[PDB]
């Protein structure tokens, strides 16, 4: 039979063992990470790492019994956990007879938004393997379905029409969200040239005129929503000012 992995949690050593002060050769690509949706049937499924590693085909694989994996997330603060994957049998060939080299993967370590993750792994008996990745934010097509992103407006489709109306005045149309009632419309060319404020408790297509001080033809229009959970840091919507037929 072929070896598989049985993985479990481990206390593990202090995260200093992960500080590579010599550079490892860059063409050693035996450790890979990618994010996967854990449940595909769900809109907001937990986001997990799929950590894959390749076992080098030489003498030493026959003595291998376990692989250790530790993950450190750095965003607004550090996180640090470790797993040990035990191989269920000893390795009879230095590559798998129905494939190429030996490759195994562990799915776990839920992924947070906007975090840089350091992943290191080492074989037992003996960071030898290392890979990092920075997780995307609420504009990523997969992460936008997270509750934190949706509640900050990641899926709001205001359908902005922003249009040069009269002498230096711009009419901005947009459809509100049920997530909040307060909005700010802004026009910016070489500098911010205009701002206005509308409050709308109704889910409707509202309209507002923003007074601009410079040329308002081809500048960006920026819509700011003020939803509860995101305070002053909700996802903003951008457009461009055009003429009105």
């Amino acid at each position, epitope marked *: 039979p072929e070896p598989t992995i049985q993985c479990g949690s481990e206390p593990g050593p202090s995260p200093e063992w992960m*500080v*590579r*002060h*010599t*550079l490892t*050769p*860059g*063409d*050693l*690509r035996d450790l890979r990470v990618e994010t996967i949706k854990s449940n595909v049937d769900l809109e907001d499924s937990p986001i997990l790492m799929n950590i894959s590693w390749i076992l080098r085909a030489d003498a030493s694989i026959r003595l291998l019994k376990a692989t250790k994996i530790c993950v450190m997330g750095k965003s607004h603060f550090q996180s640090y956990s470790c797993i040990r994957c035990n191989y269920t049998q000893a390795f009879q060939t230095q590559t798998r007879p129905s494939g190429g080299k030996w490759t195994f993967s562990y799915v776990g370590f839920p992924v947070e938004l906007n975090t840089v993750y350091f992943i290191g792994a080492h074989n037992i008996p003996n960071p030898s393997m290392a890979v990092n990745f920075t997780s995307p934010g609420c504009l990523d097509h997969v992460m936008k379905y997270k509750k934190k992103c949706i509640e900050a407006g990641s899926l709001w489709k205001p359908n902005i029409t922003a249009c040069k109306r009269s002498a230096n005045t711009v009419e901005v149309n947009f459809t509100t969200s049920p997530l909040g009632d307060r909005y700010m419309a802004l026009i910016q060319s070489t500098a911010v040239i205009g701002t206005s404020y509308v409050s709308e408790k109704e889910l409707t297509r509202t309209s507002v005129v923003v007074h601009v001080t410079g040329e308002s033809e081809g500048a960006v229009v920026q819509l700011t929503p003020y939803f509860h959970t995101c305070g002053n840091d909700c996802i903003r919507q951008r457009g461009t000012v055009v003429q009105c037929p």
Partner: antibody, heavy 117, light 107 residues
Framework: EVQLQQSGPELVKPGASVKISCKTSGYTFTEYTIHWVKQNHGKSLDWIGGINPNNGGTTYNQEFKGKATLTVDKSSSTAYMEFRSLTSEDSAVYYC??????????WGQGTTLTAAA | QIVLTQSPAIMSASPGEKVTMTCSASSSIYYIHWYQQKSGTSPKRWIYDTSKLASGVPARFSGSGSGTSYSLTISSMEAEDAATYYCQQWSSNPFTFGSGTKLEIKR
């Protein structure tokens, strides 16, 4: 677009120190290792070493270990290479270059160093 | 340390002619990378991960090989291809470059 911009040519008296710079732009500085490469009049390319700007990890060609020192400055997105005691064997063009895996995809324009009085 | 022996050291090819140059590693590597250098400027990434073309590289260029044996091929020599080509590895420390193939245009 990514740019690696190196300091200008220098004449340096033998025995004095010199530090040349590689100003990076167009990407997240902490995401790519910076390499340094020597090309003298013999036209062959000699790797000196590399440094990861995120954590300061370094590795050298041993013919330059003890002779060149690599450092980074995150605020300016700048990498440096310092010779402590320049000799005439060190007169050459020096390149910085960016890697992610084992290959370098962007190169500086080169810095000519002359070790003479 | 890992030595990359490039052959031929110097060659010329007529326009339209097929060009092959080889890179032989003294020990095995996972990938080879190739840089193009024209007189007076920096080397430019040309073929990377053994067979992928850098941005800007015409597909008359191709790279092949594995283990210790690698090659770069130009299906139809163009005058703009005259340059020195360096192979390169970083499968073991130290990172090393090959000794270079200087390609000139025959007339």
């Amino acid at each position: 677009e990514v740019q690696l911009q190196q300091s200008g040519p220098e004449l340096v008296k033998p025995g004095a120190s010199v530090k040349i710079s590689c100003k990076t732009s167009g990407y997240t500085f902490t995401e790519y290792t910076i390499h340094w490469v020597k090309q003298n009049h013999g036209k062959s390319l000699d790797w000196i070493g590399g440094i990861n700007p995120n954590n300061g990890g370094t590795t050298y060609n041993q013919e330059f270990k003890g002779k060149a020192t690599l450092t980074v400055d995150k605020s300016s997105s700048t990498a440096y290479m310092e010779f402590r005691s320049l000799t005439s064997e060190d007169s050459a063009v020096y390149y910085c270059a960016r890697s992610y895996y084992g290959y370098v995809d962007y190169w500086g324009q080169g810095t000519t160093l002359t070790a003479a009085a | 340390q890992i030595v990359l022996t490039q052959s031929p050291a110097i060659m010329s090819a007529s326009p339209g002619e097929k060009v092959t140059m080889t890179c032989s590693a003294s020990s095995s590597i996972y990938y080879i990378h190739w840089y193009q250098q024209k007189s007076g400027t920096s080397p430019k990434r040309w073929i990377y991960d053994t067979s992928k073309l850098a941005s800007g590289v015409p597909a008359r260029f191709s790279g092949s090989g594995s283990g210790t044996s690698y090659s770069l091929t130009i299906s139809s020599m163009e005058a703009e291809d005259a340059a020195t080509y360096y192979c390169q590895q970083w499968s073991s420390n130290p990172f090393t470059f090959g000794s270079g193939t200087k390609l000139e245009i025959k007339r």
